[PDB]
Amino acid sequence: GKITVFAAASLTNAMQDIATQFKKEKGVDVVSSFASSSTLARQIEAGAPADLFISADQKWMDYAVDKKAIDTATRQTLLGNSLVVVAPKASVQKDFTIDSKTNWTSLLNGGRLAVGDPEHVPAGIYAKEALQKLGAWDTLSPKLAPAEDVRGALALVERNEAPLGIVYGSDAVASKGVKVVATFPEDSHKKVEYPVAVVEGHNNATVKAFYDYLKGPQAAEIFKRYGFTIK
Template identity: 60%
Template sequence: MMKSLMRVLLASALGLVLSFGVSAKEKVTVFAAASLTNALTDIGQNFDKEHGTETVFSFASSSTLARQIAQGAPAELFLSANQKWMDYLVENKAVDSSSRVTLLHNALVLIAPKDSAVKDVTISASWDLKAAVADSRLAVGDPDHVPAGRYAKESLENLNLWAQAEPLLARANNVRAALALVERGEAQLGIVYATDALVSKEVKTVAVFPESSHKAIAYPLALVNSKPSTAAKAFYDYLKTDAAKAVFVKYGFIIK
């Protein structure tokens, strides 16, 4: 009798497990430029609440992420901080080129520590950059690899300031690392995106680089697989909704 009762109880327990399940949430793996950290984290949380998914982000320099994807890293979506590294993946047939869209734009700014005596700066060929940096450094994403650094170099070259700037650079692995150098006072000035300056309480924007001095700062998005998972395609579509755009705008990104 006792054994029969135990079998009934076990069967009931098994039925409950099968009915309610312990199935893992469907994951979405997104590789994205470091400058998107705050906005995408918020968007991912909103998406997961609506869809019962688990969105996982890997934030780093676009160049680092693109190389990882080309080598087979398990990303499902890629959001780059410039067109070059998306071009690289398209050329290597590592993303679904038909899904490629330009999602966002940004601006390039000069920042200083919040308590710095540096105020509004007019960036032109006559600007004495060396005197402004003094005995410190100019923090920037490494121009050899990091999109923000490439934009910075292009702008400084077009403004005839690169010869002054190059020996003074503190080259960072990504734009957020350049921001951190200025936040900690390890660099007197830094060049980052407007969105990075906006999220930091430790820095202030002292100048905006002329748009005409560099290529448009564009963020292309693409699915990595031509046959994406249902969750990956849903997140791809969600990034283009008004709800997601509102979050991007909140963090200073430009929607065109």
């Protein structure tokens, strides 16, 4: 048959490679839809026919679980990731540390900070939480350049439309146009975690085969190569 996966935008490259490999190995077609985890969870709630859902945070998975849209026995934390600051490849921006006394204003220089919409995109929620903990939020809120998902924020930095952007470590690995210039301290935000679960009513042998494949060695190889930490 055919499997439909709704996955956080940050999983774009890894998921495409995994789907290709699975088709080679088992002969089944895997179609993925990528967007902010918030958007995907609301689509699942509305009745969009996805078989699997992989969120970039626990929050949006919990959301789908409460709407009775998830086969809960299948929910499991699959990946981890880091939160970093990127700049265009050709920027002269040098590495810097992120602490209570980081001067964001001079780093930006009249430019904007690209972020996933902190209102609902997981990347933006982790970022806001970190900037609030570090006391820089009040200063940065008027300087944001929000985007539809983390890849939208990444694109702004790649196209040199924003000097700095907050994305996942994995996004930097997949991007040929940016470079990591700082890494958020692990204690500044909730641990970045990706839960996976089968959508309610879609737990059949074909979907289960792919779900098991995601926790296997071939998939772990691809995830590691793209910068994700395997939980």
